[PDB]
Amino acid sequence: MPRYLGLMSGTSLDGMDIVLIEQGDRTTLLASHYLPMPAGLREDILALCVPGPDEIARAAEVEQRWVALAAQGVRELLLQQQMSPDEVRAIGSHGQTIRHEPARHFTVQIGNPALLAELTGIDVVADFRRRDVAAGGQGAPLVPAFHQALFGDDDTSRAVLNIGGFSNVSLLSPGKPVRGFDCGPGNVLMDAWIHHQRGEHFDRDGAWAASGQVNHALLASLLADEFFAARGPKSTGRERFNLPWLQEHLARHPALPAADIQATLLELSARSISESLLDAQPDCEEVLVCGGGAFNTALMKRLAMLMPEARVASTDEYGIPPAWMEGMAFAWLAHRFLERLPGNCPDVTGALGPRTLGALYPA
Amino acid sequence: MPRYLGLMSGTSLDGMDIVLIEQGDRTTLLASHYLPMPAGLREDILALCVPGPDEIARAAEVEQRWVALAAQGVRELLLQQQMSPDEVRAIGSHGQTIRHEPARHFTVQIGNPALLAELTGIDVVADFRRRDVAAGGQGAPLVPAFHQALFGDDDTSRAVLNIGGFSNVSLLSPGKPVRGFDCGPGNVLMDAWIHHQRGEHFDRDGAWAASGQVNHALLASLLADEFFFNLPWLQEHLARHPALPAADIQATLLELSARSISESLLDAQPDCEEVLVCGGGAFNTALMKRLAMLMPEARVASTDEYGIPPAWMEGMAFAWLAHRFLERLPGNCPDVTGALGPRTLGALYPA
Ligand SMILES: [Cl-]
Ligand SMILES: [Cl-]
């Protein structure tokens, strides 16, 4: 049964996930491996996420460093697992998104797959989003088909919910097509605030949020954002959720304590998920939570509250650690590419139809 | 007998070349197609070849336009030839280079291969240079292996010379492995000068050059470069000596290219019976005169004489490179590129 590596750096950017799966009758996780990303690499990536000078050269240099790190992680994992590269059929590389502009019909992942193949000695499948975009799609999210393969059940209406930077839900309804969409903010505003305020990369354990007090007025002005009304195919904020967007809202209201702002941001995520989810699937029996936000104890409470009809739990309860779900999916996408099975869900992305996603860079 | 399309921007960025080959026991050219490149697109590509603002967004939009054009040409060619896309195994896409810095270990060719796959319904193999550069190579030139496969001969010592911007040669000597290097400027300076002077893209048939007179003081100053190439570099050399007629500089520029070719080529392959010229410089009658004289003991002619039109050489090589990818055969000559060893070049974007 073939083995794959999945390689990603998400939108949180503290490091690189590497997973090893076996794709037999089902997808089995064999091993996991996390590397820290140097702070400099994280900032240089974030410096490419907004328009700037000399981007071609800058991106090429950044991408060399990102690939070097990935290959390093792959080497460490294989050695530690007593495995040779020849035991791995392919790497599925998510790359690093520096610009996602589906409305301008483009998405940009860097991560020089050719150099990744050179360094690793393993075939690499990368560049998964662009075929979806070329076919009129949003290029995202790409995890629903994997989610469906993992948790596709006729006996239960399930929502698979990834809380990364942004929140995306896969709606698995018995006797129906797979639906899904980015619900909006996950950790990203909470990351942005504690970063601006104190220089921390994220709010660990949602602790600083926990200390604060939700501001019902500010929350109402955030949830007032028209974005939430937008339905159907949607990816990574139809209103780019950022700190300039937040600060604009803050000034209008009275001066609030930072901790309260953090508590409000937490409630915003909880609320926007609940309502974007139940609106599309009121029948939801189970919410399977993955991504970093699955660790946020407070956030996980509020989801359970706001969705009383559904059982809300980490994917750990269904035998898949939440930290590794996205990487496992990119390993799976490498499999789908090699088998010429469709990677996208056209009803999720809004593409014209099913497509083979990715490109093969052979070792 | 698989069939492949080869795609690339043409000479002087005035259009796109598309070729259809059959890869049997040898490479056969079935058909050729040329599409003009809009002036906007040409200038927008050139505006990305130097560092500037908002490149990632600008490059995304330019490559959408470039891929739309390529696909338009593919469609035109296939209908005109009464062929289905299902008859073509793959497109080999050269893409469009906007930045080539092997010194900094990168090379950047745009051309959204997935969009091309989407629009043509044909598998695309692209991004040929990056694996060679990943392996410590220069990522160029990639045609030596093709030239060997095409015009390899046991009896004749050949030089296959491509005169694009720069003049790269493939030295085909019986019994020996293929060699290659850049002989200095091809059309790059001659295009740059008439562009600066008159806003023309190129000097057609080297007519303007042929109206002028060579300047020794300049020619010698130019040939004194330790390489033995751009507009500022030329104007620096111009400013030393006194005012000179534009046609004479253009004449001088033409001779610089001829001499650097003649001298470098004969230096590396003294026993050169035949020089097979291809690319845009092949149609520079004036330059082809001088080359014949400055290499008197060799037969100097375009690849037309040996069965393949000089215009389509490069496109045919990229179709060939799609073949090498799918067969998992090496596409580089690591002795020419400086790569660590043989590598399969490119990446497959399936329809
Ligand atoms: Cl995704
Ligand atoms: Cl080349």
Curated annotation (Swiss-Prot), chain A:
Record's keyword terms, sorted: Antibiotic resistance, ATP-binding, Carbohydrate metabolism, Kinase, Nucleotide-binding, Transferase
Record-linked Gene3D superfamilies: 3.30.420.40
Organism: Pseudomonas aeruginosa (strain ATCC 15692 / DSM 22644 / CIP 104116 / JCM 14847 / LMG 12228 / 1C / PRS 101 / PAO1)
Enzyme nomenclature, EC number: 2.7.1.170
Consequence of gene disruption: Cells lacking this gene accumulate anhMurNAc. Deletion of this gene increases fosfomycin sensitivity. Growth rate is not affected.
Protein name: Anhydro-N-acetylmuramic acid kinase
Sequence intervals crossing the membrane: none
Annotated GO biological process: 1,6-anhydro-N-acetyl-beta-muramic acid catabolic process; amino sugar metabolic process; peptidoglycan turnover; response to antibiotic
Function recorded in the entry: Catalyzes the specific phosphorylation of 1,6-anhydro-N-acetylmuramic acid (anhMurNAc) with the simultaneous cleavage of the 1,6-anhydro ring, generating MurNAc-6-P. Is required for the utilization of anhMurNAc either imported from the medium or derived from its own cell wall murein, and thus plays a role in cell wall recycling. Contributes to intrinsic fosfomycin resistance in P.aeruginosa.
Single GO MF annotation: kinase activity
